[PDB]
Symmetry: C4
Subunit: 389 residues, 4 copies
């Protein structure tokens, strides 16, 4: 292998084609399928794999009771062959913990998991399947990270991590890794007031991360990283089209420099956007209140124009169905002249919205860009909650 260099431009995207869907909850109704949440996909020169945080129990198992809980000693980052559902028989355990990121640098995979008590968490950084670096909490308040893939360039893989309050100012850092070893640490700069769960992708030597402000904004922070100089800037997505959940109705004008407040009752959800001038796409839940539905909106100059609105759209999950986290990934090793945007949607089932069952889990759907105008339908989870009762 050789280090991945972000030499290619982002592919132009007119619509989104289906890449994978694991149907994990449908299958797990009667097969041995692990309870998960916070899934994503990440690729390497050989292909793409699914990742998620296991809860250390099967879906039909009695220990699925209580799995709304975010952090326990029984969680682990697992990865498995794309399209399969995660079972205790087919998963690779990448690391142990309850917040993660992973990316392949062209030679080996780096995986990072945080674990431990809220006031004393720590990250273990794995490279090539072995632990190489450990990082203690710097603020004593739930050290945590992206919950989707990082991006590498010339062997340098930046990772955004946050430690501190979910509902007040926190301490966010960008750590630049090479072979799992810290090359540089930056404190977050810029105008984003709060940063969690960054979804990142790269093209032409630039890494862009679209994140979650859990404190104030219904608009999403955007971090722009130069992995060569190891420097960054941050602000908010300018567009009036707000993409956090919960959020208020979209105003007539967005805000690049400050959080747009409002919405009820959730303070945030992980999400993403591809930001490339006219070739810009924003994902969001269809409901402004809850994690239901998912739509892709083509919003030219969303990153820079406070008045930018949608010129096209594609419903990914209809609003009668539950969604969840969403994030970016790219098959940087595809046989193409451009890097083609891909994304996944986490389809959360169970608590708290379906509180008739005792568990919380998800399945995954993933799509990639097409220059064609492709028809669309809803790629909802497809399980009947009544079958679990």
């Amino acid at each position: 292998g050789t280090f991945l260099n972000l030499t290619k431009p982002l592919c132009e995207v007119s619509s989104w084609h289906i890449l994978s869907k694991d149907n994990a909850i449908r299958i797990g109704e009667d097969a041995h399928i692990l309870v998960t949440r916070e899934p994503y996909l990440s690729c390497d020169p050989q292909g793409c794999r699914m990742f998620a945080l296991s809860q250390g129990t099967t879906l039909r198992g009695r220990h699925a009771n209580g799995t709304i809980h975010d952090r326990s000693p029984f969680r682990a980052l697992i990865s498995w062959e794309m399209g399969q559902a995660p079972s205790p028989y087919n998963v690779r355990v990448e690391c142990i913990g309850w917040s993660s990121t992973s990316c392949h640098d062209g030679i080996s995979r780096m995986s990072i998991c945080m674990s431990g008590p809220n006031n004393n968490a720590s990250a273990v950084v794995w490279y090539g399947g072995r632990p190489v670096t450990e990082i203690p909490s710097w603020a004593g308040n739930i050290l945590r990270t992206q919950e989707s893939e990082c991006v590498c360039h010339k062997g340098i893989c930046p990772v955004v991590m946050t430690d501190g309050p979910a509902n007040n100012r926190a301490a966010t850092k960008i750590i630049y890794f090479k072979e799992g070893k810290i090359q540089k640490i930056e404190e977050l700069a810029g105008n984003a007031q709060h940063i969690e769960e960054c979804s990142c992708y790269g093209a032409v030597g630039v890494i862009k991360c679209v994140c979650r402000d859990n404190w104030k904004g219904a608009n999403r922070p955007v971090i722009t990283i130069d992995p060569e100089m190891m420097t960054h800037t941050s602000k908010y997505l300018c567009s009036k089209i707000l993409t956090d959940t919960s959020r208020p109705n979209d105003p007539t004008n967005g805000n690049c420099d400050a959080p747009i407040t409002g919405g009820s009752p959730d303070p945030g959800v992980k999400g993403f956007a591809f930001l490339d001038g006219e070739n810009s796409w924003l994902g969001r839940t269809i409901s402004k209140d809850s994690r239901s539905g998912y739509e892709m909106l083509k919003v030219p100059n969303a990153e820079t124009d406070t008045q930018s609105g949608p010129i096209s759209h594609q419903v990914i999950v209809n609003n009668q169905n539950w969604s969840g986290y969403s994030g970016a990934f790219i098959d940087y090793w595809a046989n193409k002249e451009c890097f083609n945007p891909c994304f996944y949607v986490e389809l959360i089932r169970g608590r708290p919205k379906e509180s008739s069952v005792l568990w919380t889990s998800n399945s995954i759907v993933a799509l990639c860009g097409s220059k064609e105008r492709l028809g669309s339908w809803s790629w909802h989870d497809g399980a009947e909650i009544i079958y679990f009762k």
Copy 2:
């Protein structure tokens, strides 16, 4: 690897020997086995694999209820090691959708799946395990394809696709792929009035496809393709021995140029034939009404002689047992001086004929030619439907 060239003649066949049988319904009564339908086999330089369209649930799972349904967001083309039954633990997800084809060109495997709503379906073409091409519906009416393997020659893999009515004239095309990229598109020519679900095989630079006319004919359309010139002709199988289901009693004379109408109540089933002058074999269900039984009939000059009849036969599935789809494949990489014909029979269990259960699934049996005169017995599914009730 090097591109497969169809340089060899078709092997002479006197009888059929057992190749594989997965016993999927028997096993799935108590193991975690995926609900499937529309199966086939396809080979590569390493060996042969089984393929089918999953329904995204196990057979004993509650979500098996309703799996008579043809098209949903929970279906995918899966492949697995020949002889094993398909489980969520052992399958490779080739692509996502509800109609498929797949073939190996000698270097990598191309897999194609259609998905989406009836009026806006699309094909995603995968090559070497990555998506490379997308094709939108051209007629807005269930874009669909072969449901068995395609065939490649010098890197060129033609695929027959249809978009339009199941019960009226439709828009069929032959798309010639190379590395999953479109080289040429032809509109279907010839006298076949309606084309679905082509079963194809190749020898000496010729690709022959035997298809399903769902509109009029109880005789099967035959498409003859030159993968070098990328041109084709089409007509009907000439023999009076009719091989669609449903069909009327065989007349005294077949018809090469026009559909022979009649039969009740089904308009069609996927099937196949090997057409090589005196070395010609037709498969069909034993019942002229329903998908029950399966027989191989040696009908010399079936392709060209309207009066041709059987000179030998071999029952594959007795008429007291359910059959289903059937199709052609060949291990083009076998250590032999000729390409030996193989075929599979889909053994459908459940709805609509066994409506005492809520599901529809199948198992697979596959056989290959022998120059020996081998004894035969019935290779039925072998599950007891009562055990599922």
Copy 3:
């Protein structure tokens, strides 16, 4: 790889050490384990694997009902990693049928399965994972073979096959294969009156097979093969120590040339012996009536001396436990200066002796020679039949 040559002598054996045990019935009480019978082991340059005839259902599955039945379209030769229990998730399907043999020639594995109706069975010969040769029944009466491994020398792999009555004279042949292709066919010569289920091993250019006479003898036929000249002789094991089941009490004198009759009520069981002058070991069930217990007896010159008796023994399965078939195999690719004898015992559970359950299956234990004097205990199946009721 290079062809295996039988250049080495047989190792001296003083006792038997444990090699593997799959505990298949214990595990299968609650895991997805295939119903099997007629198991064996066979090695290759990479290691050893377990083989058996699947019944195409799991042990706890409803289709296990009726699995006392010997021959059905739902059986297949399966192989799996030594020590694991056979599941639908971990087995390789070698071929389809209800009688088998398999062996590796140093380059690739040959596997043979018979299938079909009693009066019209056929063998399909596979080599390197592909079917290469087909053989029709020559006597129209259950064409069948060894049910344990064959042996190869300089690419030549002889296989003993029988077609005809189980209770009268039958037509036995030795077929000499190379790369799955017939090199020569011999009709059985010698004084053995009936030959079934040969257990074979090789050393110094000689292949010896110890078989089952189902017609007359309670003494076992022995076939001695020269795989270079492709010729053989046959007679009975000379020793007064009789090793078929059922059998009468051992007489004062054995018989080399003719069957010793008597015993009740079973006409035979597959078994084996290692015959090397003073270094000779006979296996047999402990009960002279039934398939219970298993003992290894060191009987110097058993092959040639009608008065030879045991000078040492090792109980493998105590007589309070069920046994079954037994057979020979050798890791011909071991890092040793001699070929070390190994054997397996099939531990049959269920019908007909435990008719309180509806099924018949087995687990496996396998042992190899040691020059040490090792302590021994019983390696019985270990399942409680009551747990299955």
Copy 4:
């Protein structure tokens, strides 16, 4: 591969980071997970794997009843991918028996299992996946070994084995293997009065084993081995901090040369320590009576100073949770300039402490050293015993 040489010093350790956790009992409540005990981890150039002694049944299976029993013909040493739970579908059977050790010499893995009756047990030594050496019991009283990994240096892998009483003087030997072949046998020397279940690690040409005295001492024997000269010494851990279970309260002064008696009611448990001057860490159960809790104590000069006490600590399992065996391993092939200490804790569930269920099994947690001061929490098993009732 090339032989591992113990050329590197031991890494300095300030705290312990999470390496792996399989959650086997949680998962096994509803998945097919093997009953085990006596687990460990062992690495090779490719990575690390989990090992344990299977009981030849699943956890939910009826045959789990009675698995408190230590020795049966249904046990085997199994290994599996680190982090997964052990299932009959994912384990490699290393050898058959009820006491084991395993280690990789840089080229291949040696695995050893004892099996047989108490008065006639024997070890089978496997190398490169094949049996190479057999060793009969020398004292006729439960020949047994380490239950964690051995250590290799220049191809020489010493193994500590004991044969004789659990409650009186026994016959312990160190056997020096190369490629599974005995190079030398030493009778145990030194002042340790009784030696069982040694936990070993190596650095700078020295192998140190920390063991269990089941006869007298609540202090742990320490064996120091020179794998080049193939010689050793033994005595007790000097520290007043006693680390066997059961044990009395720690005295004011430890004892290097003689057992410190007392404690009730258990005579011993397998444990470990890393002994490197000031860089010394002792593990022990938190309860002095029972196998509950687990703590790591940094005790400078524990090996040599009878008055040495803890200067820091880290709770691994809180005292409200069950622990069990603990042992040492090191990834000798890590990309580091020092050998970093790792350890596992066996988390025993079921009998005899939870006698409300009929079974005994365990899960695994494993941790490795860090020079960072990392926060900690309890890594208990996490299953609810009530769910199994």
